[PDB]
Design a protein around this ligand. Structure first.
Ligand SMILES: *[C@@H]1O[C@H](CO)[C@@H](O[C@@H]2O[C@H](CO)[C@@H](O[C@H]3O[C@H](CO[C@H]4O[C@H](CO)[C@@H](O)[C@H](O)[C@@H]4O)[C@@H](O)[C@H](O[C@@H]4O[C@H](CO)[C@@H](O)[C@H](O)[C@@H]4O)[C@@H]3O)[C@H](O)[C@H]2NC(C)=O)[C@H](O)[C@H]1NC(C)=O
Length: 361
């Protein structure tokens, strides 16, 4: 089983204990660690943070301790304009230029592969995404002729049915990618004023519309569209989403005035790291949707949808029963990496839990 774990560049800037460098990563925890995110300048892959070259090296030294550990560099991300990707992929001239610049870059910094994070291609992009993947793989296969281990090629893909139909040719790209990560944790919709869980495992025996907004349907749909199970990776969030309540109503369907207040270390409205959530739990009321099998907590006017060891183990078992390639975690720096916030002195509580399930048959 594969355990794909993302590490984010900007987490180094968080104050105090929040700060996280490749350094803190347990080499034997994951099978793959993906660095986020690489950028594109003059149609060529390039670094993002001033010190990426230093962090790249730090990250890849972990391979001295665990010889089997594989690393990948991810291109794109949310702060990377979708249009920018769209523009590079439409012109065969800029696409070939970008493709050619990747292998040497990855080779120089010691990466085993490339992860595509185009978020997201629109209806007019589907064709071009296919060409990018096909050509990128062809270039990787060609470079392997030089007597070196072929670079890996993966992609982070939306888990929303509409988003999938609109910009992805799943049957086509599945045959060229090494693995596919399903972003099964952006299910609730940042668009409207209502309390709801962003990473429901199951549909919910109790609310008709939007049965497509849960991991179970996303996986079933990808398998139906032709993505082989042995290439699908289910994404598991290590963060939580917050909301500020517009009323004293805490139960499902409760009015929302906006995003929850920022966390001490995370400093971003609407989200909280799991270690920030562990501190939040004190004096908070804990609830759990029986149908979706995911928890949520409330304190004052703050409502938080998140994942704990049990909901995460739950998702892992589901992943196994459907015989998928494995799990993907977003992200290592949002889990209790120091292991000093969430009671149990255990390091990476959430990611370890996923690993326990994957290691037992
Ligand atoms: C990820 O990679 C991307 C892609 O390279 C980086 O994005 C782009 O970075 C450039 C440079 O920082 C920004 O473009 C500016 O380009 C010139 C100034 O840059 C040149 O200026 C002169 C030549 O004109 C030269 O001496 C310099 O050495 C340098 O090469 C500006 O003219 C240009 O100014 C205007 O910006 C307006 C926006 O307010 C536009 O309307 C105008 O058309 C005009 O370009 C521009 O500011 C870009 O901002 C940036 N993305 C683009 C091109 O949209 C990116 O920085 C990198 N990310 C990170 C985190 O490093």
């Amino acid at each position: 089983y594969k355990l794909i774990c993302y590490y984010t560049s900007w987490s180094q800037y968080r104050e105090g204990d929040g700060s996280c460098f490749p350094d803190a990563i347990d080499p034997f925890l994951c099978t793959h660690v993906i660095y986020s995110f690489a950028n594109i300048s003059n149609n060529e892959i390039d670094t993002w943070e001033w010190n990426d070259v230093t962090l790249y090296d730090t990250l890849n030294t972990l391979k001295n301790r665990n010889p089997k550990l594989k690393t990948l560099l991810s291109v794109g991300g949310w702060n990377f304009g979708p249009e920018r990707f769209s523009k590079i992929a439409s012109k065969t001239q800029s696409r070939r230029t970008f493709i050619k610049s990747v292998p040497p870059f990855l080779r120089t910094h010691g990466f085993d592969g490339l992860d595509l994070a185009w978020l997201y291609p629109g209806r007019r992009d589907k064709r071009h995404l296919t060409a990018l993947v096909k050509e990128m793989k062809a270039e990787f296969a060609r470079e392997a002729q030089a007597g070196t281990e072929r670079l890996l090629l993966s992609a982070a893909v939306s888990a929303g049915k509409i988003a999938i139909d609109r910009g992805y040719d799943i049957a086509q790209i599945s045959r060229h990618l090494d693995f596919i990560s399903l972003l099964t944790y952006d299910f609730h919709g940042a668009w409207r004023q209502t309390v709801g869980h962003h990473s429901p495992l199951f549909r919910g025996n109790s609310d008709a519309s939007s049965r497509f907004s849960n991991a179970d349907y996303a996986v079933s749909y990808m398998l139906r569209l032709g993505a082989p199970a042995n290439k699908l990776v289910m994404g598991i969030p290590t963060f939580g989403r917050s909301f500020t309540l517009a009323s004293s109503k805490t139960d499902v369907g409760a009015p929302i005035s906006g995003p929850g207040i920022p966390g001490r270390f995370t400093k971003e409205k609407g989200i909280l790291a799991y270690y920030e959530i562990c501190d939040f739990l004190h004096g908070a009321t804990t609830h759990r949707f029986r149908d979706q099998q995911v928890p949520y907590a409330t304190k004052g006017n703050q409502w938080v949808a998140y994942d704990d060891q049990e909901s995460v183990k739950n998702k892992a078992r589901y992943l196994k029963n459907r015989q998928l390639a494995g799990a993907m975690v977003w992200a290592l720096d949002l889990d209790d990496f120091r292991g000093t916030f969430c009671g149990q002195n255990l390091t990476f509580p959430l990611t370890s839990a996923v690993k326990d399930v994957l290691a037992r048959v």
